[PDB]
């Protein structure tokens, strides 16, 4: 797949991603906060089409992500991220995609998520998060 790396910012304003109910997660793109002003991150598109778009718009800065969780699984012989759920201090967004395979979850007790990096081919291959105070 095609690797990407957004880098670190000062916060998160909007997350936009797409999924498919039979396969996994496709496109991924995020609007970050850069010192009090919006910042449009590059858009990480999938190599194929057919996904459903989802827009998650946080009420920044009073609302922020407090737990990220999902499922990773085997699709067409490849290991990919199959589901994704974002829970904040106000509401939960998810799950999106198939909830099947091996689950992972990252609850934050103190700190913030300020950046993302990963890789997408047909589906999102893997990803990592940037943490901070």
């Amino acid at each position: 797949g095609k690797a990407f790396d957004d880098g670190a910012f000062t916060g998160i304003r909007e997350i936009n991603l797409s999924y498919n109910k039979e396969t996994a997660i496709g496109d991924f793109q995020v609007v970050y906060d850069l010192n009090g002003s919006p910042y449009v991150g590059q858009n990480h598109s999938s190599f194929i089409s057919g996904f459903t778009p989802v827009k998650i718009s946080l009420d920044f800065p009073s609302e922020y992500i407090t737990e990220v969780s999902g499922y990773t699984g085997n699709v067409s012989g490849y290991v990919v991220v199959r589901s994704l759920t974002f829970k904040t201090n106000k509401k939960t967004y998810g799950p999106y995609g198939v909830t099947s395979g091996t689950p992972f979850n990252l609850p934050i007790e103190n700190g913030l998520i300020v950046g993302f990096k990963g890789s997408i081919g047909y589906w999102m291959d893997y990803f990592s998060m940037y943490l901070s105070l």
């Binding site: 290991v79 990963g118 291959d125 893997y126 990803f127 940037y130 943490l131």
Partner: peptide
């Protein structure tokens, strides 16, 4: 060396 750094967790999904 002149670039700031931050902690990073993952990846989750395919290896390497």
């Amino acid at each position: 060396s002149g670039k700031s750094q931050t902690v990073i967790v993952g990846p989750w999904g395919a290896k390497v």
